[PDB]
Coordinates of N, CA and C and ligand atoms in Angstrom, one line a residue:
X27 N -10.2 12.3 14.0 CA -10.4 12.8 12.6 C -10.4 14.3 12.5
X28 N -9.6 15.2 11.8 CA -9.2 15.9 11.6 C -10.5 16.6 10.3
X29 N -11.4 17.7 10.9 CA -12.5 17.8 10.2 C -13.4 16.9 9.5
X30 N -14.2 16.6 8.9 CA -15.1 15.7 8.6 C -16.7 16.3 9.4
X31 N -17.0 15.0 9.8 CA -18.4 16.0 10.6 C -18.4 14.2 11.8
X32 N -19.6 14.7 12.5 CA -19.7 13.8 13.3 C -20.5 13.0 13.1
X33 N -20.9 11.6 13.9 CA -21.3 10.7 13.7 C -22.1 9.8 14.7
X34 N -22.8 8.8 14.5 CA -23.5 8.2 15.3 C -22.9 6.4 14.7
X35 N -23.5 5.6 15.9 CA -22.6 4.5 15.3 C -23.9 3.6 14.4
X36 N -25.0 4.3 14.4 CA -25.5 3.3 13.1 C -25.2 4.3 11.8
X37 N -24.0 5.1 11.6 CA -23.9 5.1 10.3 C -22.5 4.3 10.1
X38 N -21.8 3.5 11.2 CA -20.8 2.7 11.2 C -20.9 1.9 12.0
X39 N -21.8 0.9 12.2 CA -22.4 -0.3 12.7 C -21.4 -1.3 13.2
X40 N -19.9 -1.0 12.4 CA -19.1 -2.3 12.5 C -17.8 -1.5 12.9
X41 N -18.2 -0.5 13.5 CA -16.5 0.3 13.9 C -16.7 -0.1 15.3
X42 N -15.5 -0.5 16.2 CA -15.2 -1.1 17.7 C -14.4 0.0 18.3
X43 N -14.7 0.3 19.5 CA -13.9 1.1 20.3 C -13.1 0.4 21.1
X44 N -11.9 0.3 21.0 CA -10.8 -0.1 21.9 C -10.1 0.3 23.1
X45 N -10.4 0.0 23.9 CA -10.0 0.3 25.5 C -8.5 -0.6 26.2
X46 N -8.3 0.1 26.8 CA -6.9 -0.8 27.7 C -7.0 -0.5 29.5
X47 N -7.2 -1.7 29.8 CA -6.5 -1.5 31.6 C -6.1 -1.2 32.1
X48 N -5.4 0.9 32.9 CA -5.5 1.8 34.4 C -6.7 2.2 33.6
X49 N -7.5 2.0 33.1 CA -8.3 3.2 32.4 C -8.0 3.8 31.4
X50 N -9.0 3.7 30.6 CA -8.5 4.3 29.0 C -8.6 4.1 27.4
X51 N -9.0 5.0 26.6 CA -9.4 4.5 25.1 C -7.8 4.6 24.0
X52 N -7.7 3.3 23.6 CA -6.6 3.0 22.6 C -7.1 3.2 21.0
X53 N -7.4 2.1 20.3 CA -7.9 2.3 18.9 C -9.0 2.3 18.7
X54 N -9.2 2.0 17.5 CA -10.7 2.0 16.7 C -10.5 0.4 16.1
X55 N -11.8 0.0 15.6 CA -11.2 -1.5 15.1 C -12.7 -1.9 14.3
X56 N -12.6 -2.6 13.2 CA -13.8 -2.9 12.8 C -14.6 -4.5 12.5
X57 N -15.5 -4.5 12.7 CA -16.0 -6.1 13.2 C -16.2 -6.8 11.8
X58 N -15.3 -7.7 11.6 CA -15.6 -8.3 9.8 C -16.3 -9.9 10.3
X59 N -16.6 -10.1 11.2 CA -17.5 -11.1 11.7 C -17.7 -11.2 13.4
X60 N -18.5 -12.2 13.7 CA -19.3 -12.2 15.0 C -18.8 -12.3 16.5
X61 N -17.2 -13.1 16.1 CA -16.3 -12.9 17.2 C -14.8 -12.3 16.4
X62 N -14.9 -11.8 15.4 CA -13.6 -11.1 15.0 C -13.6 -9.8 15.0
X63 N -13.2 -8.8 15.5 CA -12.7 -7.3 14.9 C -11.1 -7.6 14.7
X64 N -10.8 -6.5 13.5 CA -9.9 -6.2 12.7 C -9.6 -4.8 13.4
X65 N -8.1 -4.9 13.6 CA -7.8 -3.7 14.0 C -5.9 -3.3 13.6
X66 N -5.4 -2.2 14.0 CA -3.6 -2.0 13.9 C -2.9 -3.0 15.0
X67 N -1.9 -3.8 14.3 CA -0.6 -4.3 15.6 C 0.0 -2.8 16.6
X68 N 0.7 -1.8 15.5 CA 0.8 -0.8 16.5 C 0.2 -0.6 17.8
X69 N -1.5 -0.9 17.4 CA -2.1 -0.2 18.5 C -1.8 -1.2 20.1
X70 N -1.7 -2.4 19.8 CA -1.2 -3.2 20.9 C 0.0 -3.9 21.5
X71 N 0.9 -3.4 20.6 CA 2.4 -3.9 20.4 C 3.3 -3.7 22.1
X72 N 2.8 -2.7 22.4 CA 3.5 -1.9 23.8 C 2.9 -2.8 25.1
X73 N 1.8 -3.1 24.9 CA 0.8 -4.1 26.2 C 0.1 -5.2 25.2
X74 N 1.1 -6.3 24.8 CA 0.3 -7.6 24.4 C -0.2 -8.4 25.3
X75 N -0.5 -7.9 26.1 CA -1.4 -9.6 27.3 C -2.6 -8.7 27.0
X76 N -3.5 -9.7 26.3 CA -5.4 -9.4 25.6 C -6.1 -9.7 27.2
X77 N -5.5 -9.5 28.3 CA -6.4 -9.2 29.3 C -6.8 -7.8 29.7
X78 N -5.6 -6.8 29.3 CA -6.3 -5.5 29.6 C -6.5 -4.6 28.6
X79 N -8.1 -5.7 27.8 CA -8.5 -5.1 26.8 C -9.8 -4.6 27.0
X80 N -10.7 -4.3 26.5 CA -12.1 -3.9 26.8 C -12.2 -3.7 24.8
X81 N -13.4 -4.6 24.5 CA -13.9 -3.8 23.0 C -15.3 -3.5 23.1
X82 N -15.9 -3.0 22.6 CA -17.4 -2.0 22.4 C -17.6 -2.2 21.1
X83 N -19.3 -2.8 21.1 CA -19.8 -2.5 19.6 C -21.1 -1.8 19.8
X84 N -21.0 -1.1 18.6 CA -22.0 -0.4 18.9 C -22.5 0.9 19.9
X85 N -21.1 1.3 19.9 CA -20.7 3.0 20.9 C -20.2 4.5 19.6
X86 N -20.8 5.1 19.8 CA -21.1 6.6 19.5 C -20.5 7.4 20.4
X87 N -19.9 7.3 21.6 CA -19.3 8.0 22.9 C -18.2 7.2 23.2
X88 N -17.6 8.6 23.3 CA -16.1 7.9 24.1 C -16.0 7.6 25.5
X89 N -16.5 8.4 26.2 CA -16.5 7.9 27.6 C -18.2 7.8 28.4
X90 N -19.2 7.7 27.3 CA -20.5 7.5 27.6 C -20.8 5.9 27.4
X91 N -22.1 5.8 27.7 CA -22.5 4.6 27.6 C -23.9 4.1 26.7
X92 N -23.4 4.8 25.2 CA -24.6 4.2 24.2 C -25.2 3.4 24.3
X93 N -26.2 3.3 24.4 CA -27.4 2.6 24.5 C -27.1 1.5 23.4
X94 N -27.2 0.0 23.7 CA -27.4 -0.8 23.0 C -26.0 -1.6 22.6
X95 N -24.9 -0.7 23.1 CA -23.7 -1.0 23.0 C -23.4 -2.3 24.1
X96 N -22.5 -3.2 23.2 CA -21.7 -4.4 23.8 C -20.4 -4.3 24.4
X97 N -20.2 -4.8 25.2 CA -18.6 -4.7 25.9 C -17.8 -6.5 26.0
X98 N -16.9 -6.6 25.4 CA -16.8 -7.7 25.3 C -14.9 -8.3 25.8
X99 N -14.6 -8.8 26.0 CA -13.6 -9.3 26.7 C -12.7 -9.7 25.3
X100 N -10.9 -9.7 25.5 CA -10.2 -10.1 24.4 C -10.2 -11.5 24.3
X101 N -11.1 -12.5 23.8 CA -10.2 -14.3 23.9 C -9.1 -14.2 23.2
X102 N -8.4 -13.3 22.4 CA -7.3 -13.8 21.6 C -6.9 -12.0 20.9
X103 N -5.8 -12.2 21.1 CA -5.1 -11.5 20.7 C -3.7 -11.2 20.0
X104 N -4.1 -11.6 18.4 CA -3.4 -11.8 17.1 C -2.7 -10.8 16.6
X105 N -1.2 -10.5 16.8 CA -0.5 -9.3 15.8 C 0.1 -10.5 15.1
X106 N 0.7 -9.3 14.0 CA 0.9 -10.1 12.4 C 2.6 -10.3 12.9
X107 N 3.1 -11.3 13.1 CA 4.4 -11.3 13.1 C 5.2 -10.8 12.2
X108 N 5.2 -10.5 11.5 CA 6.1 -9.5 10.3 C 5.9 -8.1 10.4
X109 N 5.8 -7.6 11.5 CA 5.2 -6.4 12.0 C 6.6 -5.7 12.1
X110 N 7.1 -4.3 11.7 CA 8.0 -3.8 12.5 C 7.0 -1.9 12.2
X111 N 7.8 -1.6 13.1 CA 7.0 -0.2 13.7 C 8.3 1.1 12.4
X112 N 6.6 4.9 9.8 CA 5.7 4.4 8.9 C 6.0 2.5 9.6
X113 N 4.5 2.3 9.4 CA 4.5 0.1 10.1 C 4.3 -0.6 8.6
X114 N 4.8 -1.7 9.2 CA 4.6 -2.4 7.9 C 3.8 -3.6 8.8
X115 N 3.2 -4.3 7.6 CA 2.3 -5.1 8.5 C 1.5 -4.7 9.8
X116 N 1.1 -3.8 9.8 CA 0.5 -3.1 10.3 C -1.3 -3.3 11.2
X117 N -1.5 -4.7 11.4 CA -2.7 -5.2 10.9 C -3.0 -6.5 12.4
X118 N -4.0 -6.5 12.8 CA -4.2 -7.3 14.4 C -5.5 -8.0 13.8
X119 N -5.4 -8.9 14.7 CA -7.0 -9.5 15.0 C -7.8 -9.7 16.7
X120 N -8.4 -9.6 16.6 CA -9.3 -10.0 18.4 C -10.3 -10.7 18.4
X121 N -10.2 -11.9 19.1 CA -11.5 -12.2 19.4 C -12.2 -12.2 19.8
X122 N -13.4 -11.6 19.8 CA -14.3 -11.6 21.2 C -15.3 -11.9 21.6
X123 N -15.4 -12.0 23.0 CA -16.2 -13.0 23.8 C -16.8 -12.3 25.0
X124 N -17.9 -12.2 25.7 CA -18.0 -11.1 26.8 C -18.0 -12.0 27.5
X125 N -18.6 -11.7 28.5 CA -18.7 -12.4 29.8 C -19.7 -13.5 30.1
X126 N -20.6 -13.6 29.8 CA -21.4 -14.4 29.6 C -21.1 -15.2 28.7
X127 N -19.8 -15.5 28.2 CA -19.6 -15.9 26.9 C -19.9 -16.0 25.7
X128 N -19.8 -14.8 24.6 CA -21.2 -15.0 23.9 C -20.6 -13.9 23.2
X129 N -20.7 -14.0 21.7 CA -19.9 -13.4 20.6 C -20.9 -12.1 20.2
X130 N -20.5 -11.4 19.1 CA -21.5 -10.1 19.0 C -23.1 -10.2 18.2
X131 N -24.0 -9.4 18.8 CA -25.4 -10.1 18.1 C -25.3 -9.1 17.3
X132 N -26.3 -9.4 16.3 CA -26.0 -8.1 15.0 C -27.2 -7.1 15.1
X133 N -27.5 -5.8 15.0 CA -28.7 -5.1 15.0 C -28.1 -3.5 14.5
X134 N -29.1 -3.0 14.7 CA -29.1 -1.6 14.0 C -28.1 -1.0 14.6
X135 N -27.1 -1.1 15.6 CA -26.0 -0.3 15.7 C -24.8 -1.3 16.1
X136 N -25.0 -2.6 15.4 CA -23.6 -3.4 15.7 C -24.0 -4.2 14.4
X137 N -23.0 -4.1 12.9 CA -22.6 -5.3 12.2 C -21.8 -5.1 11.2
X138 N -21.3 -6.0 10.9 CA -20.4 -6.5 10.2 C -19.9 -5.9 8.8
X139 N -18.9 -5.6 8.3 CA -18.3 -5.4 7.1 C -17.6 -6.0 6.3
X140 N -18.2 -6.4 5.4 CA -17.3 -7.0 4.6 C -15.7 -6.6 3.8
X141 N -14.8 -7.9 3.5 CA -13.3 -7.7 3.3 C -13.5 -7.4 1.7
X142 N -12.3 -7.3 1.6 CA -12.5 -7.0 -0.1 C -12.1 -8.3 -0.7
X143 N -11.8 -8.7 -2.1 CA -11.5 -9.6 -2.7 C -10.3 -9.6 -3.0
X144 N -9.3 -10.5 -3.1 CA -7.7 -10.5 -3.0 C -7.1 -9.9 -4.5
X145 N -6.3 -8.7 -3.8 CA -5.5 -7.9 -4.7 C -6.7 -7.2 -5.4
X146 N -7.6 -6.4 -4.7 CA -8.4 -5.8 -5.5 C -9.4 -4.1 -4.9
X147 N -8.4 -3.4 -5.2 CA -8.8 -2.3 -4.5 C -9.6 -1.0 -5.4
X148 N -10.4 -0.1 -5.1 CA -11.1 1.0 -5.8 C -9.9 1.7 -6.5
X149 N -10.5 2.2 -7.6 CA -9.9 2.9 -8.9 C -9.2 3.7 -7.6
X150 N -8.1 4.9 -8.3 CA -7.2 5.9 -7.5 C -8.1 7.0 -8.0
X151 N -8.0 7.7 -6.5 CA -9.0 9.2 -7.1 C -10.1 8.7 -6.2
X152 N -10.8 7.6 -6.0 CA -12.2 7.4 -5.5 C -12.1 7.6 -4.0
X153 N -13.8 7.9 -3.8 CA -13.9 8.8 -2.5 C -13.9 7.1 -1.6
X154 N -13.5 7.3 -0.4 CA -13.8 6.0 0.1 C -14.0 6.9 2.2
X155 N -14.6 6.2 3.1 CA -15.1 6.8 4.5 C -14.0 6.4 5.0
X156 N -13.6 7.3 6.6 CA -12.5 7.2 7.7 C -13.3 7.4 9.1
X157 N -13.5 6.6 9.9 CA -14.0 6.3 11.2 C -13.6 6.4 12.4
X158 N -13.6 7.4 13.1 CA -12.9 7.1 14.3 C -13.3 8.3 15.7
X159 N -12.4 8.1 17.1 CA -12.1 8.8 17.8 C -11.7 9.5 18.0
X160 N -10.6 9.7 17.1 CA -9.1 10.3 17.1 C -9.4 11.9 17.4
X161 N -7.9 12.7 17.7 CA -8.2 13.9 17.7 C -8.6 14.8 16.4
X162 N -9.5 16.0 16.9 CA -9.9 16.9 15.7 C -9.1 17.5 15.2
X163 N -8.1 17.4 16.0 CA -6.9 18.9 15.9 C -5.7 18.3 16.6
X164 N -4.7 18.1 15.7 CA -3.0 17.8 15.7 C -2.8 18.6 17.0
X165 N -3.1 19.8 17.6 CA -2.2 20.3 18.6 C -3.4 20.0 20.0
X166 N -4.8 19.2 19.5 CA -5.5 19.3 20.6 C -4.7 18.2 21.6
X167 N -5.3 17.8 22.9 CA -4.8 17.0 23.7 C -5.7 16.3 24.2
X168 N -7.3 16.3 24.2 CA -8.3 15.3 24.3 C -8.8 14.8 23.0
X169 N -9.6 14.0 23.1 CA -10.3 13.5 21.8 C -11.6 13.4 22.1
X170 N -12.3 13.6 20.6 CA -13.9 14.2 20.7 C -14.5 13.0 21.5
X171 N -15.2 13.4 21.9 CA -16.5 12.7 23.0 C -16.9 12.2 22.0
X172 N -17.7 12.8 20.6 CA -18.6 12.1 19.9 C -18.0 11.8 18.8
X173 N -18.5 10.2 17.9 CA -17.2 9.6 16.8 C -17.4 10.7 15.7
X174 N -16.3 10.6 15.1 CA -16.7 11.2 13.8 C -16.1 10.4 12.6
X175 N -16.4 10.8 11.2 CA -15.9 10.6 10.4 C -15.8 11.2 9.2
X176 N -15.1 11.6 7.9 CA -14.8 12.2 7.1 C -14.6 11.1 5.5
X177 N -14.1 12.2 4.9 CA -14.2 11.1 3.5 C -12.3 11.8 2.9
X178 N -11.8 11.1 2.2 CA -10.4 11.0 1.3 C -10.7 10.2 0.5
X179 N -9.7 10.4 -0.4 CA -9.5 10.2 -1.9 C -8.5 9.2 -2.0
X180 N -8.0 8.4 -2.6 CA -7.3 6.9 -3.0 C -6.5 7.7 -3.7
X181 N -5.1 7.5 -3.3 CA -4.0 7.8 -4.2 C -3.1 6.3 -4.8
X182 N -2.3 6.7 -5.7 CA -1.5 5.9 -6.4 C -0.7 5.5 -5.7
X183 N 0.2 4.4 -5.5 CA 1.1 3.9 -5.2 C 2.5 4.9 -6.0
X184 N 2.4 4.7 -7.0 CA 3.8 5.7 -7.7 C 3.4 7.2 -7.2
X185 N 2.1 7.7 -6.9 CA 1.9 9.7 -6.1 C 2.1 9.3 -4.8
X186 N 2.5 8.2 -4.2 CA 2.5 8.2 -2.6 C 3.9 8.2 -2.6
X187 N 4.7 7.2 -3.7 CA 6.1 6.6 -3.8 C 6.6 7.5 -4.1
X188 N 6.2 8.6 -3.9 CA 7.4 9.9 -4.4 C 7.9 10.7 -3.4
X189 N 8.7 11.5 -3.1 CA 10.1 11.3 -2.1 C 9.0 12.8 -1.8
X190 N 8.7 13.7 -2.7 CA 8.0 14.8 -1.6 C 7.2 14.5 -0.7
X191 N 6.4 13.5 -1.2 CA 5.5 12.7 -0.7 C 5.8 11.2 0.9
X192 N 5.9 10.1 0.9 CA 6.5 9.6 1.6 C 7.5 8.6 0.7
X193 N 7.8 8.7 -0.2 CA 9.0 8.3 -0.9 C 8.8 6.7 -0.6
X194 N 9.8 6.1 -0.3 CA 10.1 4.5 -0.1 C 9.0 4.0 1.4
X195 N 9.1 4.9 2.0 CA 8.3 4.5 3.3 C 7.2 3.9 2.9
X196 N 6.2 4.2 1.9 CA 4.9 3.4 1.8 C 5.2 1.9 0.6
X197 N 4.5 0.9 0.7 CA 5.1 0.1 0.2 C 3.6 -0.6 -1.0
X198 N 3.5 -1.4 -1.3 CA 2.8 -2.1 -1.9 C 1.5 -2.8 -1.0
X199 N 1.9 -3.0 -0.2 CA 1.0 -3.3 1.3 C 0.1 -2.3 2.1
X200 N 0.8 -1.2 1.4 CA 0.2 0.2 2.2 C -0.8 1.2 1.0
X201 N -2.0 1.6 1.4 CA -2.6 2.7 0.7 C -2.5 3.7 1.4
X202 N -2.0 5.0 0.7 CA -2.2 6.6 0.8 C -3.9 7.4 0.5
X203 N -3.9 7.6 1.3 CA -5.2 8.9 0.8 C -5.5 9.7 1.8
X204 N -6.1 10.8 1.1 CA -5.9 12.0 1.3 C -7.2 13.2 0.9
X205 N -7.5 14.3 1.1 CA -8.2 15.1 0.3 C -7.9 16.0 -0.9
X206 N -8.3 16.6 -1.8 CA -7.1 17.2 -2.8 C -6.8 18.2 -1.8
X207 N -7.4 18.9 -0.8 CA -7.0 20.1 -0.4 C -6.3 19.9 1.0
X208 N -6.0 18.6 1.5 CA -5.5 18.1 2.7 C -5.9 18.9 3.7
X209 N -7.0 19.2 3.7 CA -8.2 19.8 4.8 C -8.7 18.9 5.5
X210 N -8.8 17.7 5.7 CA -9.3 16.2 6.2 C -8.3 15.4 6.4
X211 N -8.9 14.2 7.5 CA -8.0 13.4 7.6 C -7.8 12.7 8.9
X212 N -7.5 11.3 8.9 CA -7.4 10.4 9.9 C -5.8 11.1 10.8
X213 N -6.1 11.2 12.4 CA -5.0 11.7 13.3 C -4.8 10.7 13.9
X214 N -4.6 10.8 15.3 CA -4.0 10.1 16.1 C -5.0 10.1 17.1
X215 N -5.1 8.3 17.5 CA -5.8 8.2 18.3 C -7.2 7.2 17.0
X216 N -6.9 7.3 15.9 CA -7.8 6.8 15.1 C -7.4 5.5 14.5
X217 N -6.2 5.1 14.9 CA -5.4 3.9 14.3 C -6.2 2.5 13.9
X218 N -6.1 1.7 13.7 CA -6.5 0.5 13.7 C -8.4 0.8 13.2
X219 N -8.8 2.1 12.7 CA -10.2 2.1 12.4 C -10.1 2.0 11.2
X220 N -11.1 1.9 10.4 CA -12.0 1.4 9.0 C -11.6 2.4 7.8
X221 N -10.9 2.5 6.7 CA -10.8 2.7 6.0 C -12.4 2.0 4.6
X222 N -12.9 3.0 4.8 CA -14.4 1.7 3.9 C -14.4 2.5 2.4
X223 N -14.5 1.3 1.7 CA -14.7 2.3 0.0 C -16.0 1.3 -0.4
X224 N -16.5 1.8 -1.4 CA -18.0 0.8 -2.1 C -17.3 0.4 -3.2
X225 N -17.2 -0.8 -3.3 CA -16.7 -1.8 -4.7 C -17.3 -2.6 -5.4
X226 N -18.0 -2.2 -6.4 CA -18.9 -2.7 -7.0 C -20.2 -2.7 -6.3
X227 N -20.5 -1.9 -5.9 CA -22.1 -1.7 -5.3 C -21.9 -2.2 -3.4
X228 N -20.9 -2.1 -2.8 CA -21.1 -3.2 -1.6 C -20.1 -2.5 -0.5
X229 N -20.2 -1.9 0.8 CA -19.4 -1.4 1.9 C -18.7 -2.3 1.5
X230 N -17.0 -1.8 1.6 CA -16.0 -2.5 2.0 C -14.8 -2.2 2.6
X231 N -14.1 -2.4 3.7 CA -13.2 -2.4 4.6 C -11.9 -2.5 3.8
X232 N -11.3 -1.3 3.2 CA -10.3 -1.4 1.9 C -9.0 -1.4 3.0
X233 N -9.1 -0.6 3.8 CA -7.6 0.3 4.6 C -8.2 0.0 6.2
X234 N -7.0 -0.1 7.1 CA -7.0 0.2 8.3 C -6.0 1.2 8.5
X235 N -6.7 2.2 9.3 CA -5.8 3.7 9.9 C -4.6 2.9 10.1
X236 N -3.6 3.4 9.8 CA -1.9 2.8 10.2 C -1.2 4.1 10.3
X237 N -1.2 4.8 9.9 CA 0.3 6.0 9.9 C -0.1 7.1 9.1
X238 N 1.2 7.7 9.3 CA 1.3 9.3 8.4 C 1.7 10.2 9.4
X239 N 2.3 10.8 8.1 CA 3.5 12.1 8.7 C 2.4 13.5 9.0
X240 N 2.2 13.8 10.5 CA 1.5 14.7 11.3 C 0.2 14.2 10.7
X241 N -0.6 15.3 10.2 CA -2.1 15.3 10.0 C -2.7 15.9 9.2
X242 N -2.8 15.8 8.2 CA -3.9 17.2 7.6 C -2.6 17.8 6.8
X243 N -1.5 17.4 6.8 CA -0.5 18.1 6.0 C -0.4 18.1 4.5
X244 N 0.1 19.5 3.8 CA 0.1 18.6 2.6 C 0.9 18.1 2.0
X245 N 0.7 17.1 1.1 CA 1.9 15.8 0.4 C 1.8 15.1 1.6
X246 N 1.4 15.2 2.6 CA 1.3 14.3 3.8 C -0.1 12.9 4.0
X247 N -0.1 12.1 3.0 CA -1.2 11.8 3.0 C -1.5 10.3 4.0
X248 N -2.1 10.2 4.3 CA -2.6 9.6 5.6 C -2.2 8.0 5.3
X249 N -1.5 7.1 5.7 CA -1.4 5.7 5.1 C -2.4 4.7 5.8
X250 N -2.3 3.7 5.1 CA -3.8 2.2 5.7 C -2.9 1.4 5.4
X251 N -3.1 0.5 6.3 CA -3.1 -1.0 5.6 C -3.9 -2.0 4.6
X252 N -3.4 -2.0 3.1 CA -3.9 -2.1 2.3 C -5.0 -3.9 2.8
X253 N -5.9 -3.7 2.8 CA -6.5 -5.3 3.4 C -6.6 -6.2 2.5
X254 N -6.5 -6.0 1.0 CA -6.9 -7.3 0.3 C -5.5 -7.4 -0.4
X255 N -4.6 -7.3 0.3 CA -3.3 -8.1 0.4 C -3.1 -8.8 1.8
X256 N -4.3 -8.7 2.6 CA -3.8 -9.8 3.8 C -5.1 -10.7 4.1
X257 N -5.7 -11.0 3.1 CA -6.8 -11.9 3.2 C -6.2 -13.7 3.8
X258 N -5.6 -14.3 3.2 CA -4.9 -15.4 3.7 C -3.9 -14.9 4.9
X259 N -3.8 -14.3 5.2 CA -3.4 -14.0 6.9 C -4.6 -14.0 7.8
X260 N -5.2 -13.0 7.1 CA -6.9 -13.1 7.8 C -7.2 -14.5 7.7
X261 N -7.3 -15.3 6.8 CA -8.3 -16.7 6.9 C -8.1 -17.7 7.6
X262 N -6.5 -17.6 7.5 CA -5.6 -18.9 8.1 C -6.1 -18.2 9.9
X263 N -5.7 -17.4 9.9 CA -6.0 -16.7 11.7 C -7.3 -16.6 12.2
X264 N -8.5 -17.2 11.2 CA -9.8 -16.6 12.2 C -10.3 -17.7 11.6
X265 N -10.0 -18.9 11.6 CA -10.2 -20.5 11.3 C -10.5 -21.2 12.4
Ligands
LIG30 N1 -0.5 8.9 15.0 C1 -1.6 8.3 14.3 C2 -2.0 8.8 13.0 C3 -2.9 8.1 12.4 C4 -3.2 8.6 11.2 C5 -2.6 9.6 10.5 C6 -3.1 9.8 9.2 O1 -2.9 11.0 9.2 C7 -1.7 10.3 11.1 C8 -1.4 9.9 12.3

């Protein structure tokens, strides 16, 4: 995340850290129930065997060991077959199971967020949260030890669909947002994390980090995968 401020994981209880096998942190991902996190196909497309996965609930450190945090094994590892790499379909599932066999327990730094309602996203303009690891800085080359997060603004589908902007590249499936002053913003390394807005009184998981041209640019506004256009992908897959 590209400015914002930092964070601890009980102010994001339901953001997952994603790891891959020689060693090493991949996405962000967020837990919408007890053995499910929601995360990007991108982020897994390159190494799909869900054995060299590692997920974490309830971690605040990237290469520390938060107190209280879960480490849990992939049982299943779900990309959206209509996926092509700006992504379309853009959107995974995981199941998880640790070792002892045994799905995630819920407490003050691990739970759940609720999906939104089908075809139903916050007014444009509204502030909604961005969660992640990612780098602070486009030209840095590590990423922060401690999570952070930031806030952006909901843009239009017709202010995203304009050619200064990402023209045709974003689609109906996809939300843009941004800051007005594109001083903030989801980078790299933050993929597959929580896009959360409040809808009608209630945390909700609107966007998953997916794309965007550099970082922090302006007319450059950050894209998600819009989630309450993939609820019956979600239902049918975690049945
Ligand atoms: N390469 C990942 C990446 C994620 C997100 C944004 C949003 O700016 C940009 C880039």
């Amino acid at each position: 995340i590209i400015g914002g401020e930092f964070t601890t994981i009980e102010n994001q209880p339901w953001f997952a850290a994603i790891y891959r096998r020689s060693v090493t942190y991949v996405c962000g991902g967020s837990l919408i129930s007890p053995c499910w996190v929601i995360s990007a196909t991108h982020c897994f497309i390159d190494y799909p065997k869900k054995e060299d996965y590692i997920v974490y609930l309830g971690r605040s450190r990237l290469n520390s060991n938060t107190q209280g945090e879960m480490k849990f094994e992939v049982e299943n590892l779900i990309l959206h077959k209509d996926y092509s790499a700006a992504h379309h379909n853009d959107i995974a599932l995981l199941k998880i199971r640790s070792k002892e066999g045994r799905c995630a327990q819920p407490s003050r730094t691990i739970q759940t967020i609720a999906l939104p309602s089908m075809y139903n996203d916050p007014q444009f303009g509204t502030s909604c949260e961005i969660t992640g690891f990612g780098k602070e800085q486009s030209t840095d080359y590590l990423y922060p030890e401690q999570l952070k997060m930031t806030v952006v603004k909901l843009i239009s589908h017709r202010e995203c669909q304009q050619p200064h902007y990402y023209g045709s590249e974003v689609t109906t499936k996809m939300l843009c947002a941004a800051d007005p002053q594109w001083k903030t913003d989801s980078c790299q390394g933050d993929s597959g994390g929580p896009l959360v807005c409040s809808l009608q009184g209630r945390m909700t998981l609107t966007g998953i980090v997916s794309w965007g041209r550099g970082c922090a640019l302006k007319d450059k506004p950050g894209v998600y995968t819009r989630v309450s256009h993939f609820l019956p992908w979600i239902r049918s897959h975690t049945k």
